[PDB]
């Protein structure tokens, strides 16, 4: 997908009292036309198991 | 945020901007020798720090 989107994700989970580093927020908000990387995931297992 | 193809900017430095400019200049003028200021007031940004 396309860097926004990983911003836009990764920022809105900040916890309370924290933000997305600067740096990393930007090179993803910088990201121009035609550049992607892969979609963050929340990775949950079937404890049960 | 981004402004155009190129370049971003960022709200605080965006109200900075929308603040009239008065030239250098106009700041020394004087009229027969004494010091004179015709132009308005300074538009400006008040912090409560």
């Given amino acids: ?6 911003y836009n994700y990764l920022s809105s989970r900040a916890p309370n009292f ?4 600067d740096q990393v927020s930007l090179k993803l ?6 550049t992607l990387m ?5 990775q949950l297992l079937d404890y049960d198991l | ?8 900017t960022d709200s ?3 109200m900075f ?15 027969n020798g004494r010091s004179v200021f015709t132009e308005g007031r300074i538009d400006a940004i008040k912090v409560n720090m």
């Fill in chain 2, 1 to 8: 945020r981004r402004v155009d193809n190129t370049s971003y």
């Fill in chain 1, 38 to 42: 892969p979609r963050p995931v929340v």
């Fill in chain 2, 12 to 14: 605080l430095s965006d």
């Fill in chain 1, 1 to 6: 997908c396309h860097p926004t989107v990983v």
């Fill in chain 2, 17 to 31: 901007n929308g603040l009239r400019s008065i030239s250098s200049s106009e700041f020394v003028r004087s009229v």
């Fill in chain 1, 18 to 21: 924290l933000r997305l580093d």
């Fill in chain 1, 29 to 34: 908000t910088s990201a121009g036309i035609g």
